[PDB]
Amino acid sequence: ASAAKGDHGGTGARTWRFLTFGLALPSVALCTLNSWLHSGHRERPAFIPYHHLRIRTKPFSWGDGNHTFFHNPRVNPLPTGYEK
Amino acid sequence: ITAKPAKTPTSPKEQAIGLSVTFLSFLLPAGWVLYHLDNYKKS
Amino acid sequence: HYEEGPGKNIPFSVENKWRLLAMMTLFFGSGFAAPFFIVRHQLLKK
Amino acid sequence: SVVKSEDYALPSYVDRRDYPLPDVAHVKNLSASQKALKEKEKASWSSLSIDEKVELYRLKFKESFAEMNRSTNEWKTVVGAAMFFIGFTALLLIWEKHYVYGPIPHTFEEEWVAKQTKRMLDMKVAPIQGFSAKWDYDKNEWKK
Amino acid sequence: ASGGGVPTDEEQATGLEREVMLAARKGQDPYNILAPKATSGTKEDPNLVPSITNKRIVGCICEEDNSTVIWFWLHKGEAQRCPSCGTHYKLVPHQLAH
Amino acid sequence: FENRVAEKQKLFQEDNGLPVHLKGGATDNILYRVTMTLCLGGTLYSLYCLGWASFPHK
Amino acid sequence: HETDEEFDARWVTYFNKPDIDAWELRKGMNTLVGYDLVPEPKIIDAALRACRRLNDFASAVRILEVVKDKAGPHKEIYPYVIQELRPTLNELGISTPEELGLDKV
Amino acid sequence: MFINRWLFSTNHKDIGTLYLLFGAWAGMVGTALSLLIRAELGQPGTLLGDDQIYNVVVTAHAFVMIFFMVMPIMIGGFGNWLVPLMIGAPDMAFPRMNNMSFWLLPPSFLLLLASSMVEAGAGTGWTVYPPLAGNLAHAGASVDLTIFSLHLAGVSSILGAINFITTIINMKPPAMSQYQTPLFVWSVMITAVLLLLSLPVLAAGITMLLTDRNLNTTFFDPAGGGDPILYQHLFWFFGHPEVYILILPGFGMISHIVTYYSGKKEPFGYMGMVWAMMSIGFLGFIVWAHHMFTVGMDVDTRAYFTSATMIIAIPTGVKVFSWLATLHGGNIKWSPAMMWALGFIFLFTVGGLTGIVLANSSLDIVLHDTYYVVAHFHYVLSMGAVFAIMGGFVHWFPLFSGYTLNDTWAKIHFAIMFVGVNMTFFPQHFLGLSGMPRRYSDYPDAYTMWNTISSMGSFISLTAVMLMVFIIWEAFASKREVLTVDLTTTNLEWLNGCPPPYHTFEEPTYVNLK
Amino acid sequence: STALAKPQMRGLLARRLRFHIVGAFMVSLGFATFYKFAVAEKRKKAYADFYRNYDSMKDFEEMRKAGIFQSAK
Amino acid sequence: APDFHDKYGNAVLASGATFCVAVWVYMATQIGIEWNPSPVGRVTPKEWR
Amino acid sequence: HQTHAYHMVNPSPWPLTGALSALLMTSGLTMWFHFNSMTLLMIGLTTNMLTMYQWWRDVIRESTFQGHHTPAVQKGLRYGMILFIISEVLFFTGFFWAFYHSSLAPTPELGGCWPPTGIHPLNPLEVPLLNTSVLLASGVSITWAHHSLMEGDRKHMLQALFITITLGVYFTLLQASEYYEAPFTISDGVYGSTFFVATGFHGLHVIIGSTFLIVCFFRQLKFHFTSNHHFGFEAAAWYWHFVDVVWLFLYVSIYWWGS
Amino acid sequence: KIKNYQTAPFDSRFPNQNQTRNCWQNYLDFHRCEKAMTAKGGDVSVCEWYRRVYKSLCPISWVSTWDDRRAEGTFPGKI
Amino acid sequence: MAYPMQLGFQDATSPIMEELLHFHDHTLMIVFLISSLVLYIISLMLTTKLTHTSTMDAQEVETIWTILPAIILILIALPSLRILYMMDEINNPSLTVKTMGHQWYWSYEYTDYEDLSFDSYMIPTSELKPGELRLLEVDNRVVLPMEMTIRMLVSSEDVLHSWAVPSLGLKTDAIPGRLNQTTLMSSRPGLYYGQCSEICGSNHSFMPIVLELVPLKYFEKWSASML
Numbered sequence A: 001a002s003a004a005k006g007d008h009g010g011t012g013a014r015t016w017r018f019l020t021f022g023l024a025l026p027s028v029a030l031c032t033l034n035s036w037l038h039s040g041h042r043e044r045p046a047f048i049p050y051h052h053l054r055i056r057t058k059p060f061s062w063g064d065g066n067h068t069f070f071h072n073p074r075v076n077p078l079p080t081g082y083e084k
Numbered sequence B: 001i002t003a004k005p006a007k008t009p010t011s012p013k014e015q016a017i018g019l020s021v022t023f024l025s026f027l028l029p030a031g032w033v034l035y036h037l038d039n040y041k042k043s
Numbered sequence C: 001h002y003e004e005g006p007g008k009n010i011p012f013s014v015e016n017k018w019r020l021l022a023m024m025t026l027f028f029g030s031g032f033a034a035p036f037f038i039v040r041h042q043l044l045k046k
Numbered sequence D: 001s002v003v004k005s006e007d008y009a010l011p012s013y014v015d016r017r018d019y020p021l022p023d024v025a026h027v028k029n030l031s032a033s034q035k036a037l038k039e040k041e042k043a044s045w046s047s048l049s050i051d052e053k054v055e056l057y058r059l060k061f062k063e064s065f066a067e068m069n070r071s072t073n074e075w076k077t078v079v080g081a082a083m084f085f086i087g088f089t090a091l092l093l094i095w096e097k098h099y100v101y102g103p104i105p106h107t108f109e110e111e112w113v114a115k116q117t118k119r120m121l122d123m124k125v126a127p128i129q130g131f132s133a134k135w136d137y138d139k140n141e142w143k144k
Numbered sequence E: 001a002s003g004g005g006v007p008t009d010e011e012q013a014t015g016l017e018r019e020v021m022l023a024a025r026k027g028q029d030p031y032n033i034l035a036p037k038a039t040s041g042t043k044e045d046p047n048l049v050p051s052i053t054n055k056r057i058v059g060c061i062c063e064e065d066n067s068t069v070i071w072f073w074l075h076k077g078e079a080q081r082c083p084s085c086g087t088h089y090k091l092v093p094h095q096l097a098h
Numbered sequence F: 001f002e003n004r005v006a007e008k009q010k011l012f013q014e015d016n017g018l019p020v021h022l023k024g025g026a027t028d029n030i031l032y033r034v035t036m037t038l039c040l041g042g043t044l045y046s047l048y049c050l051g052w053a054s055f056p057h058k
Numbered sequence G: 001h002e003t004d005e006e007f008d009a010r011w012v013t014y015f016n017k018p019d020i021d022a023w024e025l026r027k028g029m030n031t032l033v034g035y036d037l038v039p040e041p042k043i044i045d046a047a048l049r050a051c052r053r054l055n056d057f058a059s060a061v062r063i064l065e066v067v068k069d070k071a072g073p074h075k076e077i078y079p080y081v082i083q084e085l086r087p088t089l090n091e092l093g094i095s096t097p098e099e100l101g102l103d104k105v
Numbered sequence H: 001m002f003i004n005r006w007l008f009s010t011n012h013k014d015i016g017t018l019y020l021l022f023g024a025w026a027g028m029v030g031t032a033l034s035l036l037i038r039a040e041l042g043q044p045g046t047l048l049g050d051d052q053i054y055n056v057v058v059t060a061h062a063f064v065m066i067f068f069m070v071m072p073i074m075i076g077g078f079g080n081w082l083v084p085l086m087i088g089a090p091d092m093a094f095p096r097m098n099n100m101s102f103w104l105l106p107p108s109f110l111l112l113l114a115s116s117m118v119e120a121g122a123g124t125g126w127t128v129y130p131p132l133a134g135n136l137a138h139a140g141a142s143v144d145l146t147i148f149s150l151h152l153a154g155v156s157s158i159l160g161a162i163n164f165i166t167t168i169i170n171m172k173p174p175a176m177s178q179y180q181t182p183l184f185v186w187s188v189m190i191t192a193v194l195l196l197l198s199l200p201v202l203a204a205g206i207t208m209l210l211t212d213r214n215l216n217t218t219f220f221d222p223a224g225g226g227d228p229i230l231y232q233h234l235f236w237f238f239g240h241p242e243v244y245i246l247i248l249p250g251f252g253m254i255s256h257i258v259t260y261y262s263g264k265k266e267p268f269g270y271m272g273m274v275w276a277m278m279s280i281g282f283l284g285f286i287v288w289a290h291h292m293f294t295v296g297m298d299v300d301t302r303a304y305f306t307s308a309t310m311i312i313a314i315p316t317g318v319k320v321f322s323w324l325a326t327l328h329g330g331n332i333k334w335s336p337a338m339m340w341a342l343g344f345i346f347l348f349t350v351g352g353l354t355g356i357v358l359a360n361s362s363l364d365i366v367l368h369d370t371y372y373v374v375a376h377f378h379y380v381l382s383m384g385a386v387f388a389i390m391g392g393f394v395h396w397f398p399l400f401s402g403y404t405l406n407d408t409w410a411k412i413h414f415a416i417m418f419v420g421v422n423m424t425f426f427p428q429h430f431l432g433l434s435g436m437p438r439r440y441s442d443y444p445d446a447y448t449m450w451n452t453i454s455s456m457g458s459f460i461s462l463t464a465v466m467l468m469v470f471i472i473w474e475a476f477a478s479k480r481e482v483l484t485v486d487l488t489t490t491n492l493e494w495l496n497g498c499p500p501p502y503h504t505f506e507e508p509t510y511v512n513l514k
Numbered sequence I: 001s002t003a004l005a006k007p008q009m010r011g012l013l014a015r016r017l018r019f020h021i022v023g024a025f026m027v028s029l030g031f032a033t034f035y036k037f038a039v040a041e042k043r044k045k046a047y048a049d050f051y052r053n054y055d056s057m058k059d060f061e062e063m064r065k066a067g068i069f070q071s072a073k
Numbered sequence J: 001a002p003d004f005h006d007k008y009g010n011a012v013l014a015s016g017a018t019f020c021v022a023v024w025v026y027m028a029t030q031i032g033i034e035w036n037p038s039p040v041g042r043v044t045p046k047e048w049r
Numbered sequence K: 001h002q003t004h005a006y007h008m009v010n011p012s013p014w015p016l017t018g019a020l021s022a023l024l025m026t027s028g029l030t031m032w033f034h035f036n037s038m039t040l041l042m043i044g045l046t047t048n049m050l051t052m053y054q055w056w057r058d059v060i061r062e063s064t065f066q067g068h069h070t071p072a073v074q075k076g077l078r079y080g081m082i083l084f085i086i087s088e089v090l091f092f093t094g095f096f097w098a099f100y101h102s103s104l105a106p107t108p109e110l111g112g113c114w115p116p117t118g119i120h121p122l123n124p125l126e127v128p129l130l131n132t133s134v135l136l137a138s139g140v141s142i143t144w145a146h147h148s149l150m151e152g153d154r155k156h157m158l159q160a161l162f163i164t165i166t167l168g169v170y171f172t173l174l175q176a177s178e179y180y181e182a183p184f185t186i187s188d189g190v191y192g193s194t195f196f197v198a199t200g201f202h203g204l205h206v207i208i209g210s211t212f213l214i215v216c217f218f219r220q221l222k223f224h225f226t227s228n229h230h231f232g233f234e235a236a237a238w239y240w241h242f243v244d245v246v247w248l249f250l251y252v253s254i255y256w257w258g259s
Numbered sequence L: 001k002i003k004n005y006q007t008a009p010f011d012s013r014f015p016n017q018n019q020t021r022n023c024w025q026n027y028l029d030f031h032r033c034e035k036a037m038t039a040k041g042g043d044v045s046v047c048e049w050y051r052r053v054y055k056s057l058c059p060i061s062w063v064s065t066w067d068d069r070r071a072e073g074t075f076p077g078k079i
Numbered sequence M: 001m002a003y004p005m006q007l008g009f010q011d012a013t014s015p016i017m018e019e020l021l022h023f024h025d026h027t028l029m030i031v032f033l034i035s036s037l038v039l040y041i042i043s044l045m046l047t048t049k050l051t052h053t054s055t056m057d058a059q060e061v062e063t064i065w066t067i068l069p070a071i072i073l074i075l076i077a078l079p080s081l082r083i084l085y086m087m088d089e090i091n092n093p094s095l096t097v098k099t100m101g102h103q104w105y106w107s108y109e110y111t112d113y114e115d116l117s118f119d120s121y122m123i124p125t126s127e128l129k130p131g132e133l134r135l136l137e138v139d140n141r142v143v144l145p146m147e148m149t150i151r152m153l154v155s156s157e158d159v160l161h162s163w164a165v166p167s168l169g170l171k172t173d174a175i176p177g178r179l180n181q182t183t184l185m186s187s188r189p190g191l192y193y194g195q196c197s198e199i200c201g202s203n204h205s206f207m208p209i210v211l212e213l214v215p216l217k218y219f220e221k222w223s224a225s226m227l
């Protein structure tokens, strides 16, 4: 399986380390960069009390029974709407 | 299959007893509950 | 080491046939009785 | 002979129609007179008596074909006991009906059934084969 | 660009794994990892069956491709014969005892 | 760090009749006893919770 | 496979082996009763003579019982076989099971 | 001593023994549940006076017979006892993990019983379909407890499946090919594969049901765009392989038993038997929606599921005929185990043949959710699986114990059982053709005669269950110790004596290559 | 005085099977055919006869007069 | 000489069959079990309206 | 004495503690969901950790210290592990099936479209893509670690393994952050339900996988592994690849196709 | 054009047993058509067909629930 | 309905159900043939003293016992499939009726023209009039025109139910959020009964279905009066 490379006659750990630093890690830096310049933040979506969303058929069994586990006040409305 | 004669023979009288106790251990506690169903149904 | 041979490779004793019989009778009878007592319990709960 | 339980790794004697010549003789230890009989066997067999021929046989084999294939009366016990315990089960049924079951619904009263039958005939239940087909609507009776 | 520091089996293997490794090195098979090879199995050329006691269970696959193995105890003493195909087997002592 | 494997091999191969889960000494025994106590006490408590849940309440 | 005549001959040979041993005798009879046939008198004859060389009177009787057992409901097979073996039975002093009373329970 | 041996075991024989004790005890529970069903239906009207309780009883009947009686006895019990002995292996591959497969069953069973004691129990059917099994129609802990019970049974069987496949692949004598292993071993291998593939899917489906009940997911709830039919897929994708899983080891025992008591050295067409079990295993994964012919699937899907299901009769016919061919020419010994085997062969066929009737989605419209289904599957289970269990139990009882059963008593027991299971289940075909629904606590009056007979038949089988306990006591009370067993040259499990020592094969068998 | 004739001695089991397997088909087919003639053909004939001179209105009318319907008195 | 089945078989057979038949016949017909058989040819229909 | 090469395991209390700990965990969850109490659960979790700790320590004692893992024993452990991964695959299959069923035939209550009305999916090209590159990268570094080990290179084995663990941890922190920022929750109909349960179980496997790798790092530090014998490391690497592959499927199905 | 409406005819777009999407689509079509025929002061009778078909096929509670949601601004279909 | 001691299917009221009845007869004939064959063979194997306990050759006899059953399955599947397509075939209904399952009763909607709907409950046993059937009668029957193709739509407003009428060949599960279609056609007028056929709780056994089949003109008058 090819895309622009050699390696097969004498190798091993050396070849794999080469691929770790020459290709794998730089891809991670490239994607991190690509991520870093899309951050800032994002327009909190408008609240519409859709009945297929914000399901409560039984309270959650922590806090006040109405907040999901990774609740984020900024972007996660309750069934009655965003919190003050 | 071949076997040695019983080391501790269970005679016909002993079988009768084994059989009786076995059957009663099943029938009594069940009969007791079923007999009293209505008493329970008047809950 | 563990005892080997007939009547030794089981977790209950068969040394006395009358004691065995009481045991089997508790063992099998409790399993048989259990559902009748679960039905009773549910009737009496209301 | 006396077969022992630790002998399980040693060849053993069976009587089977399909394995007529087992791995060992039925009797392996011989009395003084039995040894002398085994000695006789080395000579012509016309010189052995019937009794001696029979004893030779019994040293080698436990049962004859005729004995090993004998039928028994066991079936009678099995069937008789089965029937007895089946009959015993009827006592539990009588018990249950007497002390456990209350009354059946009133829809099984004779008058209910007569009426219910008529309505069923009025609505032509299973008119093709099952039910109403068995009623003669002209003669107003069950078909003969 | 390569150090060492990783021990080898030869340095560090212990207990039974070591015994197997060592016996393999000397071409021996004391823990019965390999299938033994039939001899001709006649009276004079019997299958020699190693054991640490006085009897061992033999299974005989009489012909290539039989689905059924014939099992019997082989005892110390004269050669015995598979009761199905008559190949001879004789029990031989120890070795595997250190 | 240094290779102390040989010592451990020596300690765990020691022919003292102890099973592997107690061969390391006093600490094995404690940890074993603690694990057992929590399991058996936990089980007892779950039985108590069942019987308590099996009846209706307020 | 192989023919009737080929089958009979191989068995006749098997039991004719001068120095047949006790294990071989047994193996031969225990194999033969596996087949869907009652063995030809020529085969039984050879087997009987093998018992004689091994000085084993009891096996000769047992072999006759088995010929009778294999015939199952075919009542005619056994008397015919005994008829054909009668010269051998007289020569060797072999008594039938019926003559020993071993056919009765 | 006692604790080390019985609570901390790492031995395949003692752990097979714990399985058999457990499965026996569960079997009494399942029996009692079955008699409550029949007492309620035994006359028109209401007996318990609470149909939620009847629903709970029916639901628990099923879980207990399946997860707690059949699987632990066939796979845990006979599996552990026989598989290492049939291939010369000193024990299972993972002897300690094996003990955990066993110890998860009592807590699992505890949770099942807890569910029937809190709130009003889980009155759902063993299929546990939402929205009925959901947190509105079944609010409270009962259905959650049932779910956790299934999780633990699942995990137990998955680790058991891993242990069996590994042991069977890796611990045979080096010279022995998979094509030299006995049919019981194959049957367990194949069953272990089905288990490994199907149980995680169930585990997924009931995990989704759990989160719908407690975490506000809506996998199966139309209000969030979920779909109750999705649950039926996941469940039956597991559920159809489960029903082969319950019979395959039975097939394997039947092949041994029939072979043994015919006096044969091997079953007829060994490779055709291997092929038939493999084929059953594979086709059992692609037919599950014949459990869903009434849910409103497209006609081309139903045409496909009818056709694939029918094809299963072919490899099954091969095994049935191969058993009959193994009898041909046998030296038949009419032992009690052989009578269980023969009644298995005939009654399994009957239940198999009414499966082919149901495979037709056309006719299934009218027969689905009626007593015809119930007649169908008690034929293969109660005269298939149970009959195989009884035939296996009497055949190998002397190997496990060292003692013999009284043969005459065992034959009385078979005759009574044979009458009672037929009297119970035969009339239920008429109930189903005539239209009586499953899962009803009372019925229109027309259905009275067959229901009455059927409940009477269920008492006959009760009497056989009680007699069986006594027949077991009589064996241990008399102590007739085994001396000799026939045909050991082709039945390796007997060769170490009865019972075999704690360790067998410390020195492995010797098998030549050639 | 007279010898017994040589009987057939080979393939006795196979010969029994040859014969009986024919009988086994006869009987099998026999049950199937009885079911075909006594039940299935009877059934088709019952339905063909019932509908040949059936009148759904006459049927209705009798049912109406018997008083069975909520919709029609 | 005679086994258990030889001495007792006939007695066990006769008396098991007899007990079984009596008690079933009694249970089926004297204790008021409603079998609800076919009304066909048995029941005279009566006006219900 | 035995003359086969298989392991007869000393009698052991851990199966029973494990089973009990399962009973306590599921009793606990029950008590948690219906009675707001967490005590049973904490107890079940505690005893489950202790069980796993001791059971696995014992396996290390039996193998690195007592020499019980002959080639035959080691061959069985390979099969057992591959089989265990297969059952995990069929478990994930169940949730993929739930996702495809819901998204290919979206119901009226959702607006009859996929993604549902009102749902605002994450951008597959942002963090999910970074996450993809993180796990793929760790598949490279673990292969490097494997080869260093096989070539007897202690230093680079530890360095490759450390980088693999770090990528795993980064994946887990990025995923936690993504969960926090997500504008939908598990209670948002079947879209939240299939999304959080499927990625959540995956997230849990990354944690277990990362743990298994950390255990391997310490065993390595302590010289347990030889250049030919390190099955615990191999199993952790199979498990790591599986976690990796499952992520690729999640990404293609749910984040990309399903967005 | 097509009166003597008896019932919804076969619709080859929904040929199977599951008719959910048939109720749904025709509901959408009606309200889409009604929206358009209001924006240009037009006559709503051109939409009548969709109304009849969804009246025949849809359960009262679905229709009624969907109408409430349209009023409330939570209907999730595109109209 | 079923009558006492019934062995088979209820008499067919629709063409479809009559088609199932004959297909059942064809299948059952085969079932009888195979089971009798097996039973004869088992008993043939057990009734002889003759033996043959050595190896037998399998691969000639396996052909017969693979080809025969495949032929048989084909004789069952062909007509099975013809019927299935037919149960599905292109209808042209004159009427659409909806039924909605609830715990524990059915409602019915006839909304082609006017908005008619009503609930349909079992008559308790103590309220039955003489000649009336225990567990089967409802207070409000589903009145429909005989001899016409009707579209039934089935659904639920709560848990799963299943709407069935054996003598018409009808059984369609009732699933919330879903609309399942079946077609109904009676050759005769009268009363035809069925029962909820998917376990729905405590009163599963007590939510029956009564169809009342009448001439169109009676059907229309009944509708108007039910508004």
Ligand code: HEA
Binding pocket: H243, H244, H246, H247, H290, H291, H309, H310, H312, H313, H314, H316, H317, H318, H320, H348, H349, H350, H351, H352, H353, H354, H355, H356, H358, H359, H360, H364, H367, H368, H369, H373, H376, H377, H380, H381, H384, H385, M034, M038, M068, M069, M070, M072, M073
């Ligand atoms: C061991 C358990 C078991 C077994 C082995 C089977 C075997 C089969 N079953 Fe069954 N079945 C169940 C247990 C099992 N069943 C259970 C529990 C249910 C209910 C689930 C529930 O709702 O609770 C069920 C339900 C079930 C249904 C669902 C119907 C419904 O609910 O409406 C269907 C439909 O196709 C089905 C079909 C089959 C078929 C085709 C086989 C085949 O595998 C049978 C093959 C065997 C033979 C055919 C006989 C031997 C063959 C010959 C002698 C050859 C010649 C024969 C021919 C040419 C036909 N079964």
Ligand SMILES: CCCCC/C=C\C/C=C/C/C=C/C/C=C\CCCC(=O)O[C@H](COC(=O)CCCCCCCCCCCCCCCCC)COP(=O)(O)OCCN
Binding pocket: A068, A069, A070, A071, A072, A076, H151, H154, H155, H203, H207, H215, K029, K172, K175, K176, K179, K180, K181, K182, K183, K184, K185, K186, K187, K196, K197, K199, K200, K201, K203, K204
């Ligand atoms: C990178 C994170 C990795 C996951 C680990 C996180 C911590 C919690 C533990 C869960 C691990 C197990 C998986 C259970 C599935 C559910 C959790 C899904 C992952 C998750 O955490 O989902 C979160 C909500 O979860 C919630 O309720 C959390 C509620 C947690 C309660 C646990 C539920 C217990 C379920 C037991 C199931 C049994 C499993 C069976 C085993 C198989 C046996 C064969 C999403 O947060 P949210 O606020 O809705 O939306 C984001 C809003 N901005």
Ligand SMILES: CCCCCC/C=C/CCCCCCCCCC(=O)O[C@H](COC(=O)CCCCCCCCCCCCCCC)COP(=O)(O)OC[C@@H](O)CO
Binding pocket: K089, K093, K097, K100, K101, K102, K104, K105, L014, L015, L016, L018, L019, L020, L021
């Ligand atoms: C390698 C394996 C062998 C491969 C064999 C290939 C055969 C399998 C088929 C593959 C799936 C094809 C899916 C594309 C076809 C479209 C069908 C479809 O889209 O079906 C929809 C759901 O499908 C869905 O979830 C589809 C969900 C898929 C689940 C399928 C179940 C199989 C799972 C097996 C697990 C395999 C395990 C191995 C994993 C490594 C439902 O139907 P609708 O159209 O909404 O109804 C509309 C009505 O309202 C109007 O009539």
Ligand SMILES: CCCCCC/C=C/CCCCCCCCCC(=O)O[C@H](COC(=O)CCCCCCCCCCCCCCC)COP(=O)(O)OC[C@@H](O)CO
Binding pocket: E013, K056, K057, K059, K060, K063, K064, K069, K077, K091, K207, K208, K211, K212, K215, K224, K225, K226, K229, K230, K231, K232, K233, K235
């Ligand atoms: C709510 C939060 C709960 C979660 C908490 C976190 C849980 C933690 C689990 C982490 C997993 C750690 C596993 C460590 C096992 C170490 C034992 C080991 O690795 O043992 C090795 C054998 O492998 C072996 O048994 C192989 C053993 C393989 C086990 C791997 C299985 C992990 C599965 C865990 C559970 C999955 C749950 C999935 C849920 C759906 C020893 O052999 P070698 O390595 O060759 O050494 C010997 C050489 O030294 C000789 O020279």
Ligand SMILES: CCCCCCCCCCO[C@@H]1O[C@H](CO)[C@@H](O[C@H]2O[C@H](CO)[C@@H](O)[C@H](O)[C@H]2O)[C@H](O)[C@H]1O
Binding pocket: B027, B028, B029, B030, B031, B032, B033, B034, B035, D092, D095, D096, D099, H035, H036, H039
């Ligand atoms: C599904 C299995 C069905 C099994 C059928 C049961 C078979 C019958 C066993 C007998 O059971 C006993 O019957 C007594 C009555 O005959 C009950 O006594 C009750 O009635 C007596 C007499 O009327 C009083 O003396 C007692 O105090 C009172 O408890 C007694 O409790 C009960 O144990």
Ligand code: CUA
Binding pocket: M101, M102, M104, M160, M161, M162, M196, M197, M198, M199, M200, M201, M203, M204, M205, M207
């Ligand atoms: Cu509604 Cu069952």
Ligand SMILES: [Cu+2]
Binding pocket: H239, H240, H243, H287, H288, H290, H291
């Ligand atoms: Cu199925």
Ligand SMILES: [Mg+2]
Binding pocket: H294, H368, H369, M162, M197, M198, M199
């Ligand atoms: Mg159903």
Ligand code: NA
Binding pocket: H040, H041, H042, H043, H044, H045, H046, H047, H441, H442, H443
């Ligand atoms: Na009742």
Ligand SMILES: [Zn+2]
Binding pocket: E060, E061, E062, E070, E082, E083, E084, E085, E086, E087
């Ligand atoms: Zn051989």
